[PDB]
Amino acid sequence: PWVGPKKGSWVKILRPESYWFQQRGQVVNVNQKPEVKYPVTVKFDSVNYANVNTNGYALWEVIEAPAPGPGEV
């Protein structure tokens, strides 16, 4: 039984200290081990100050938002 958002599905970030808070990014993969605290891996078009466009988030920090659309983060 798959857990978390599907691969390639857009999710809105709910981590307040994240550089992409309330932004959206494609789900690269979700780790299926229940022991992993932050299994969801999300990649973004906008890099942060460390020039990193991907990060691993918790299961409770992604809400499966729709596609961004024209001129929308």
Binding site: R15, P16, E17, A58
Partner: protein, 218 residues
């Protein structure tokens, strides 16, 4: 792991373990400092390297030994050696008395390689944003150090933050009766377990009085 017998640098003049190095003013300042750090390693060929204190050096085909004032210089030289595929280098801190403390490959395995028996020191079980607010821990153990709070205290203050926003359902603390309480401390009735029962009944009386007073014009 067995610590070596690194002698004090002021007592090991002219040792065969010393690499051929040019020698500069950047070395440890004697006549003012007594704490020295020593790094030893075994090389395979006399490959030239750069001393952390200015000037270049040539290793020995066998054992090597260098003395430095700071652990940072020893670690810099260790990284430089490790770039040359030279493992098995150990870094010691020499106390003023001559006590040898084994520092860098502390358990014999380099810190970037996972080794069993290690425990996460200074670990915090939440995201960095999960730290409690500094304002909440005023005049407590963590007065200006909210990042040092144990996770139980963080959860407790988080629950307090959750609670102290539903203002209408809060309980105002009753005003103490200073004039008629406050006898000499020797004047007490003991019965500690009865004192909590007295707390229960007194708070029940306070709440009933408040409800009766509120149900007059509300």
């Amino acid at each position: 792991v067995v610590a070596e017998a690194i002698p004090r640098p002021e007592d090991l003049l002219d040792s065969p373990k010393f690499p051929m190095f040019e020698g500069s003013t950047g070395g440890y300042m004697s006549r003012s400092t007594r704490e020295r750090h020593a790094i030893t390693w075994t090389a395979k060929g006399q490959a030239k390297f750069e001393m952390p204190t200015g000037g270049f050096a040539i290793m020995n085909q066998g054992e090597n030994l260098c003395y430095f004032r700071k652990k940072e210089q020893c670690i810099a030289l260790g990284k430089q050696l490790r770039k040359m595929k030279i493992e098995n280098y150990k870094i010691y801190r020499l106390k003023k008395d001559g006590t040898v403390i084994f520092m860098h490959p502390a358990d014999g395995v380099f810190p970037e390689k996972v080794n069993k028996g290690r425990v996460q020191v200074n670990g915090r079980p939440f995201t960095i944003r999960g730290n409690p607010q500094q304002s909440e821990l005023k005049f407590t153990k963590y007065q200006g150090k909210g990042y040092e709070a144990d996770p139980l205290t963080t959860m407790f203050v988080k629950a307090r933050v959750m609670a102290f926003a539903d203002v209408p359902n809060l309980f105002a603390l009753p005003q103490p009766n200073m004039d008629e309480l406050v006898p000499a401390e020797e004047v007490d009735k003991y019965t500690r377990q009865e004192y909590t029962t007295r707390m229960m009944e007194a708070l029940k009386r306070v709440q009933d009085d408040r409800a009766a007073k509120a149900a007059k014009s509300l």
